[PDB]
Amino acid sequence: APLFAGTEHRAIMVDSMLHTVYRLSRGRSLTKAQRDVIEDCLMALCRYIRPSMLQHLLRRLVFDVPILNEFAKMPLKLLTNHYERCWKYYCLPTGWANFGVTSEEELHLTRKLFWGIFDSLAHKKYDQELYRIAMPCLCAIAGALPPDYVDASYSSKTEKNFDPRPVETLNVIIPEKLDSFINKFAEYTHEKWAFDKIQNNWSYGENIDEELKTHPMLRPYKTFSEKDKEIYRWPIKESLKAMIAWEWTVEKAREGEYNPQPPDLSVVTLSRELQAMAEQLAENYHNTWGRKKKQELEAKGGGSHPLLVPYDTLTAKEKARDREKAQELLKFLQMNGYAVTRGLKDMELDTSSIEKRFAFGFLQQLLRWMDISQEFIAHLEAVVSSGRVEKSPHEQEIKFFAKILLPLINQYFTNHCLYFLSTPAKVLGSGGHASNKEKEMITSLFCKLAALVRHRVSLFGTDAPAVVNCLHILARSLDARTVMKSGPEIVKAGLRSFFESASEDIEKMVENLRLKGVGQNLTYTTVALLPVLTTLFQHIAQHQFGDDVILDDVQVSCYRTLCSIYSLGTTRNPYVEKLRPALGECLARLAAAMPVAFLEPELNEYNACSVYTTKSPRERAILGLPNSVEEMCPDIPVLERLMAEIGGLAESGARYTEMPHVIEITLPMLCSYLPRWWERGPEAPPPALPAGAPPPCTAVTSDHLNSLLGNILRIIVNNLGIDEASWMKRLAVFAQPIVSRARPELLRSHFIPTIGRLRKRAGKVVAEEEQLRLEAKAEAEEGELLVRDEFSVLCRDLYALYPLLIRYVDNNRAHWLTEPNPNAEELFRM
Amino acid sequence: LRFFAICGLQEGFEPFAINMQRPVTTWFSKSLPQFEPVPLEHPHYEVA
């Protein structure tokens, strides 16, 4: 098989081989071992043949696979591997290296394959084998298709072992005006065909013979034989009766129009709608043509016509001739005034490129299936509550939604993530940016799925992890800025309701923890909400969407969430002792995202994002907002008091037990609040100073960050050596972002003594190791676990501290090396 | 050199022209079309 790479120069024979092997694979009287051998050969070939050379095999597969019968098992795997390997050749505008780039026909075939498989699987009954074999195929094809690919031959009606049956021309009759038209067209057809014969250098001779180049019908249509007239007029009679059966009412609207000459027809051009009409007419001609080939197949008694693949499947090359024939017929109709009936199909197909993008249709289908999800989840809830029903009238709907859409959604929006986040101004993806409608649709999908899952994790059961993962992916792919700034009120209200419901659920969880529905809510919030909400807040913070998303009602909901999570601090229950980490991470992300200095209410007058500024005093009372920003909730201390308390604890040298809340929630909140508001407070890059920049809404300076980092180091030193300190790893990660603004005196103040203590401990444990090695037998075996545990705790402390040290070094290496520093030298020694 | 000391000096990298009496000569891609013999291995054109 490998030798088939780079065989362009015999593509015809390679394609013939592939078709022969496929036909052998789908064969009767073939034992299972033989069939396995054939399938292995086909897959091995396709693994190495260039993607451009499998176009015809794809054209056959697009017709075969959708059936999803038993034979469809192998083709599904073949397509899965092909697309997973050649995804670049189809997706990337530049294409795969040295293999070229896809073409419109191949993209069209891929899209038809995807949608055919999708529809067949949706309508088919559940089957584990088929679902497991098909889901990867759908994922691969979706990942291969460009998100914004627009099908040139797009259709809305999408009417309909190939059985080409043309409309019954004989049934309908032929009008007499159109009979006159047909006579004129027959004269025309004789004239053009004789002009082509002239191009072939034909002559008018009483006998018919190509070698003599004599042809007795090179005589004027007046003298053209009546039988010959009849046979040159019959094709159009049949075609026009086909059109009448199609209801393409054609009428004499405008004026109507030897030496062979071609009457000019290419002069008149069919506008897009009449071009589609001619495409349908050419499809009908192809139907008659393939019916004749069928008749030949019955004459043979068994076989297959190579070009029996439908018109849409055919590439433009084979289409071109029949398209030209239909085009000529309609062109003569136009020059004879006769015009086909376009009805409303044309402008109900027109839509637009945005509605024709692949991503658009995919998201539309996903939203429709989400609507179906609402219905059967309601039914499942009703039956589970009471009245045991094992019928599950939507059973296959549940199985589809849980086994196909969820993995699909996950993989698709993991791959095409930048496309949905790119904007015309700023394109993050390789190429292309999602339209506003697509962004709104993905936002609505996220909101609807979250609402579906709310308080219903058990119902999904084993699929709940999958639903949560899908929610994470959508949250990371959501373009909240654009959706909020310009989007339908429905979508905006959906997102606002998501945030409001999240705040309510967090409040209920907090009160329950402070001490049926209780267990349901606790499980829901601790499994789906908190992770998903944390991911959403992290996404907003990373993309700086906070100044655009978290406003007005969303801002109020974020106040409620923040204030409840922090207010939970006073509690000391064992359940809290387990939930503190997740709550702290969520609070850190929320602090990184929120656009108001909630720890500096005094300077809130200058915040243009605060609700107290965006809304009017007349408003903000129609809601429950208090008169003063300070009164939103006073449980959280102001920045100065909070910093003073943290410093006091660090200096007093308390242990993790005495301040679980500070180490788990408060400190992670500050490690995100301070870096964010430093950029927007004084002592910041002043690009806005040229203008009359309003007073900064905050007072964060490098001093705050330096003090916080010193306090964190002091706290870690205080808790240094403890047997169980699982919180250090989280604290170090949370404190990493704030190191960049550390001040040079920090080295000697904190880092040198800390690493000195750590070196001393390492030396002591090494000495114990040496003493054990000096001893032997039980003396060596005993205490060996002791030294191992001592090294374990030492490694924990090292991995808690060095991650901070490295960042401090990376930012001060330049200064240390430029100007010698004895403190830096001592740190090197340690 | 503005950052040689910061990164490369201690790693043991030497400036490209450290011990050359004279500045290094350079060549540039001049965009003035010129006639040259058809390469004997040209991927597209063959002369017999």
- Collapsing DSSP to helix, strand or coil, A600 comes out as coil
User: Is the CB of A818 less than 8 angstroms away from the CB of B10?
Assistant: no
Nearest to A142 by CA among A310, A466, A434, A361: A361
How far is residue A429 CA from its own chain's centroid? 12
Question: Which residue type is seen at A108?
Answer: H
Closest CA in chain B for residue A810: B6
Question: In this complex, is the C-beta atom of A814 within 8 Å of any C-beta atom belonging to chain B?
Answer: yes
Question: In this complex, is the C-beta atom of A817 within 8 Å of any C-beta atom belonging to chain B?
Answer: yes
Q: Which ranges in A515-638 belong to alpha helices (H)?
A: 517-524, 530-542, 546-549, 553-567, 574-593, 611-614
Q: What secondary structure letter does DSSP report for A2?
A: G
A518: which 2 tokens?
């209780």
Question: In this complex, is the C-beta atom of A818 within 8 Å of any C-beta atom belonging to chain B?
Answer: yes
Distance CA A791, CA A128 (A): 51
User: Is the CB of A818 less than 8 angstroms away from the CB of B5?
Assistant: yes
How far is residue A97 CA from its own chain's centroid? 24
CA distance B6 to chain A (A): 6
Interruptions in chain A after residues (C–N over 2.5 Å)? 160, 257, 515
How far is residue A80 CA from its own chain's centroid? 18
Show residues of chain A in contact with B10, CB under 8 Å: 817
- Collapsing DSSP to helix, strand or coil, A653 comes out as coil
Show residues of chain B in contact with A818, CB under 8 Å: 5-6
CA distance A818 to chain B (A): 7
* Structure-derived torsion over alpha carbons of residues A217, A220, A221, A227, reported in degrees to the nearest 10: -30
Q: What secondary structure letter does DSSP report for A710?
A: H
* A334-356: b (≥16 Cβ within 10 Å) or e: bbbbbbbeeeebeeeeeeeeeeb
- A155 close to A349: Cβ distance less than 8 angstroms: yes
Q: How many residue pairs bridge chain A and chain B with CB atoms within 8 Å of each other?
A: 7
How far is residue A600 CA from its own chain's centroid? 40
Show residues of chain B in contact with A817, CB under 8 Å: 5-6, 10
Based on C-alpha coordinates, what's the Rg of chain B?
21
Show residues of chain B in contact with A814, CB under 8 Å: 6
Nearest to A783 by CA among A772, A794, A793: A772
- A436 close to A427: Cβ distance less than 8 angstroms: no
State the method.
cryo-EM
